[PDB]
Write an enzyme that holds these catalytic residues in place. Structure first.
Site, PDB file in Angstrom:
ATOM      1  N   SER A 149      -2.553  22.087 -31.568  1.00 20.71           N
ATOM      2  CA  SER A 149      -3.556  21.203 -32.173  1.00 20.71           C
ATOM      3  C   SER A 149      -3.967  21.438 -33.630  1.00 20.71           C
ATOM      4  CB  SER A 149      -4.817  21.137 -31.292  1.00 20.71           C
ATOM      5  OG  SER A 149      -4.560  20.405 -30.099  1.00 20.71           O
ATOM      6  N   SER A 192      -8.532  24.366 -34.068  1.00 13.55           N
ATOM      7  CA  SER A 192      -7.793  25.370 -33.296  1.00 13.55           C
ATOM      8  C   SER A 192      -6.688  24.743 -32.475  1.00 13.55           C
ATOM      9  CB  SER A 192      -8.738  26.110 -32.352  1.00 13.55           C
ATOM     10  OG  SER A 192      -9.283  25.213 -31.390  1.00 13.55           O
ATOM     11  N   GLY A 193      -5.984  25.583 -31.726  1.00 14.86           N
ATOM     12  CA  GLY A 193      -4.909  25.092 -30.896  1.00 14.86           C
ATOM     13  C   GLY A 193      -4.581  26.058 -29.779  1.00 14.86           C
TER      14      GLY A 193
END
Length: 266
Positions: free
Chosen positions: A46, A211-212
């Site tokens: 993401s 973030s991811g």
């Protein structure tokens, strides 16, 4: 030696989590920078969403698209984890609202809607090359781009490349001051990263982040922090190919973030 404690902390995490980990820190105030495996490749997951929305604003400025135009939401377009869009099936949403949705909740369908409006993964990658990012690349849409398999070049970046790109987006002149503030606000108003850097952010500081999380333990965050007395510092942290629980990966990010902030608060 300024970042010695940070390096030691990153080294401890790569051992305990038997992972691949990369970090990049950019200090815009004095042009200083530091990294650990900063040139290694990691899955974007993401963290790419910031780039797609930055491109929406860029394309809008050039008149390639109207950010206020609406796109019809159909049931067949829905992909995993789309809290905002799943409640609007049968309705139309503006591209601007789709960016707000994906930037603040990570809504995946909202992300695909933006991608289809800015030339898809290919258009995103070309845009990255134009701004000077030679590494970052987007190749698939949600959810396939989160695979995160070792050695796969698709949908990857390096901690240094994405950090530099975020620096240009928010502080360079590719986007108007209006669009820079809009992009920044979308990141500042992120609702899904409370358990990461925000949890160890120094009193009085501000933060804009994205973030991811992905396959094979992928976990990451790209953020910009600043305060009245501290010019913008860009932080990029990526973990990949680890069996660690999400809590352990969050723990890694908060420990590293804590050490990085200490460099400046001390």
């Amino acid at each position: 030696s300024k970042f010695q404690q940070v390096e030691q902390d990153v080294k401890a995490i790569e051992v305990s989590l038997s992972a691949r980990i990369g970090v990049s820190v950019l200090d815009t105030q004095n042009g200083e920078y530091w990294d650990y495996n900063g040139n290694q490749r990691f899955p974007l997951t993401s963290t790419f969403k910031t780039i797609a929305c930055a491109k929406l604003l860029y394309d809008a400025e050039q008149g390639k698209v109207n950010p206020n135009s609406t796109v019809e939401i159909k049931k067949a377009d829905l992909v995993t984890y789309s809290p905002v869009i799943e409640k609007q099936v049968g309705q139309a949403i503006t591209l601007d609202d789709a960016c707000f949705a994906t930037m603040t909740t990570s809504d995946n369908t909202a992300a695909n809607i933006i991608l289809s409006a800015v030339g898809g993964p290919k258009g995103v990658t070309d845009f990255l090359r134009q701004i000077g990012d030679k590494e970052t690349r987007l190749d698939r849409i949600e959810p396939d781009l989160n695979e995160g398999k070792l050695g796969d070049l698709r949908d990857t970046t390096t901690p240094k490349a994405i950090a530099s790109t975020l620096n240009k987006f928010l502080f360079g002149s590719a986007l108007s001051e209006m669009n820079q503030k809009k992009l920044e606000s979308w990141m500042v108003n992120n609702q899904v990263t409370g358990n990461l850097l925000r949890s160890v952010l120094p009193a009085g500081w501000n933060i804009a982040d994205r973030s991811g999380a992905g396959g094979f333990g992928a976990r990451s965050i790209t953020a910009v922090v600043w305060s009245e007395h501290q010019a913008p510092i860009i932080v990029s942290i990526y973990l990949a190919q680890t069996q660690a629980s999400m809590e352990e990966r969050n723990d890694a990010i908060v420990k590293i973030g804590h050490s990085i902030f200490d460099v400046y608060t001390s």
